[model samples]
Target: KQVEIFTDGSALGNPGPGGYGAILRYRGREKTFSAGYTRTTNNRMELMAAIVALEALKEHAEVILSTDSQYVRQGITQWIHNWKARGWKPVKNVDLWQRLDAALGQHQIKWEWVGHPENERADELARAAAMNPTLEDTGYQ
Candidate 1:
């Protein structure tokens, strides 16, 4: 069966503490995960949330990934082609973008852009984690 993933990201000050949350559901079963970063951007966390969820998969399968961030949904589905053709030279968060693409291998994914209520739980978790940031965001330059 296909997996459904809902994700969200939060940042205390856009470049201060930040976090991401994701919920993966398959056949009525669900799993959620979240983590905080000492310093990062909301967009970074948004990309990170999707990356983490895809990386968590144990096998290749159809995936429906929904996010409130057009930064992620559009970047991957729309902007990625031009970025790739241009050798990704002017891209922001290139590290996470690469990681996301890497994790996408062999899986069929559909990107969905949703509203706030569609991922309220994920938003809550992201906010909570951001409030207590701990981990380092190694590429946040």
Candidate 2:
């Protein structure tokens, strides 16, 4: 089966607190998830959403993940190659990027950058997560 997902991230004070949100669809069913970090950046949360969404899969599958994060989209699609070729010497989020690359190994993925309007709900979820600080202990580390 092919799963389709929408993911986003938000930060209230750039680096103070951050959150990630995701919506996943497969076999006519939909699932939503959100989580917050005490201290994190928006880029990390962006990668977090995609990472968590892909990690939720029950088995190997083809996936199409839509995101508003150029960092997530472009990093997976292009820049990761250069970073790896250079021994990960210049990438800022090598840890997250490596986690993302490991997550990618379980499925065939097509990444797409979506616009703001289509991403409103997930974005709002991210913002809400940052505001509430009520997430459980099951998010990606």
Candidate 3:
């Protein structure tokens, strides 16, 4: 069965507390996840949502991931190639980007872009987590 996923991220002050939220569904089962960070950027949280969702998969399968961040979708589908070719120096979130690349593994993933109004659940979770952050984004710099 194909996995259907939706993810979103949020931060209180751009570089302040942040969090990511994701929902994954497969075979009628749904899983929800979110994590808060001490200090980070919106983009980092956005990318983390995708990475966390992909890494949660237990098996290789076709996946459809919907996200509200264009940066996350386009960065993976388009910008990663040039960043890799240039040794990742110019990449903003190289740490999360690498983790996301590894998370892809053998799964076939298609990224779907959705607007803000369409991503209420994930956005709500992310905002809530950001308001009560508990962890540190060690890779954030």
Candidate 4:
């Protein structure tokens, strides 16, 4: 089985309300999820968006985790081990990094940098969810 996921996150202010949005397309079907938090950062939301999508998988499968965040793509594919070897010192988002690493072990993932189409949709979802002052939330996963 194989699946493709696109994710994005946005925050009204760096330390203000934040939101995440992700889309999962498996087989011929699709599902969407978004969430908001009282206070958080865009990086957290960006990382959390991947976490939420990965958590939805049923079992080990190939996953294409597409994102615009170089923080996520590079950290996962390049910097993760070095950080681990360095004892995670002077690193932020270690908690989220660990959670993503755990979810990663379950599947074969190809990290892709995406733009336009679903990429725009994911960005729009993220922005809309976060900018809603009240930030009621579209849905949560």
Candidate 5:
């Protein structure tokens, strides 16, 4: 059996404040994680959500990560090796990409893209976190 994780991220403006959220389901257990940022982009938050979800795994367990962003899904499943070969440059979200690449290197992982409507739980959490103007920078994980 494989653990399933669904993640999403939101931003009030393209480069404004943002947040990321994820849901992890394994066996009969479930866990949710979320965090906000003071200044960031939707792409960054999207990648951060995946990073947080993968980081939470206790072992090198088989994981199927679901997300709404093609950037997150494609970055890991398609572009990571090419990016690494290119010295991890020429990408937009290099900071989050580095974190994601490291996290992925430490785990067994897979990716899937889901429609936003079907990812309501994580979407809601991330949206709420992003809209919380009082939220402080939690620093990328």
Candidate 6:
């Protein structure tokens, strides 16, 4: 079975309250998820959104993940292998990359980049989450 996913992220002030959002559709059923942190970057949230979405799937499930951030798309589908071969060093956001790598290893995932206008639902969810006041972070900075 193949699943379709859309994910996005938002930050209040670049490193302020931030959040990631994802939408999953499979077998005509759709679900949405979102998470927020006290201190984080939009890029980290973007990558985390995709990671969380893919990790939510069962092992080995085929997935098509769509995101508005090229950072997330290219990072996973293009750059990760080279980075890993080079010892995963000399790279920014190594922590996010590590988490993304583990998530990718847990499933069969493909990626595509989309415009934010084309991903309104996920974008809105991310924005809402970022603006939510109930989130706490484990020192995400």
Each prediction's RMSD over C-alphas, in Å, is: 1.6, 3.2, 2.0, 4.0, 2.9, 2.3
In candidate 2, position 86 carries an lDDT of 87
**lDDT, residue 46, model 4:** 91
Per-prediction backbone clash count: 0, 0, 0, 0, 0, 0
Off by over 4 Å in 5: 115-118, 133-141
On a 0 to 1 TM-score scale, where does candidate 5 land against the true structure?
Answer: 0.85
lDDT of 5 by residue, 6-92 (tens): 889999887788988888889968788887777777888888888888888778878888887977767767998899999987566
Candidate 4 error regions (>4 Å): 133-141
* TM-score to true structure, per model: 0.93, 0.86, 0.91, 0.86, 0.85, 0.87
**How much lDDT does each candidate structure score?**
0.88, 0.80, 0.85, 0.82, 0.79, 0.81
lDDT of 5 at 97: 83
The positional error of residue 73 in candidate 6, measured at the CA in angstroms, is: 3.0
Candidate 3 local lDDT, 1-141, one digit each (tens): 698888999998879999998888778788888999989988999989888889888789999889879788688779988888888874778999988888876789887887433367889889898988999999987
Q: Best TM-score goes to which candidate?
A: 1
Output the lDDT of residue 75, model 6.
78
Q: Candidate 5: deviation at residue 133, Å?
A: 5.2
Ranking by TM-score: 1, 3, 6, 4, 2, 5
lDDT of 1 by residue, 81-100 (tens): 88878988857899998888
Candidate 6 has a TM-score of: 0.87
lDDT of 4 by residue, 41-120 (tens): 78888988899999999799999989998778788779999988988866777888888988999999998985537777
The residue pairs in collision within model 2 are: none
Ranking by lDDT: 1, 3, 4, 6, 2, 5
Question: Which candidate has the highest lDDT of all?
Answer: 1
C-alpha-based local distance difference test score of model 4: 0.82
